[PDB]
């Protein structure tokens, strides 16, 4: 699949949830 | 605008002047100073009636 992304407007927080490889890709972006 | 009349003849010289002079100034200022208190992730409100 693709990693789940959760965006919070109040705190300006990005939450990525997936396999460890799919999460390191967002972490470098 | 000059004309000539060969049938009559005026007496002497007449000048009939007229003067006009005007001056004016204006100045408009308009100032607003607004505060609003708010939060970071604040959203809009949908009332609208």
Swiss-Prot record, chain B:
Cell location: Cell envelope
Disulfide pattern: none
Recorded coiled-coil stretches: none
Family statement: Belongs to the bacterial secretin family.
Biological function: Could be part of the type IV piliation system (T4P). May contribute at the cohesion between the S-layer and the outer membrane by forming oligomers. Could also be the main channel through which trafficking is managed.
Protein's recorded name: Probable type IV piliation system protein DR_0774
Originating organism: Deinococcus radiodurans (strain ATCC 13939 / DSM 20539 / JCM 16871 / CCUG 27074 / LMG 4051 / NBRC 15346 / NCIMB 9279 / VKM B-1422 / R1)
Taxonomic lineage from the root: Bacteria, Thermotogati, Deinococcota, Deinococci, Deinococcales
From-to range in the entire protein, with total length: 544 to 592 of 740
């Amino acid at each position: 699949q693709q990693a789940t992304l959760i965006a919070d407007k109040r705190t300006n927080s990005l939450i990525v949830r997936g396999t460890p490889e799919q999460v390191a890709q967002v972490a470098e972006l | 605008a000059a004309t000539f009349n060969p049938t009559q003849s005026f007496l002497g010289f007449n000048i009939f002047p007229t003067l006009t002079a005007l001056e004016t100034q204006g100045l408009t200022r308009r100032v607003y100073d607004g505060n609003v208190t708010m939060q970071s992730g604040q959203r809009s409100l949908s009332a609208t009636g």
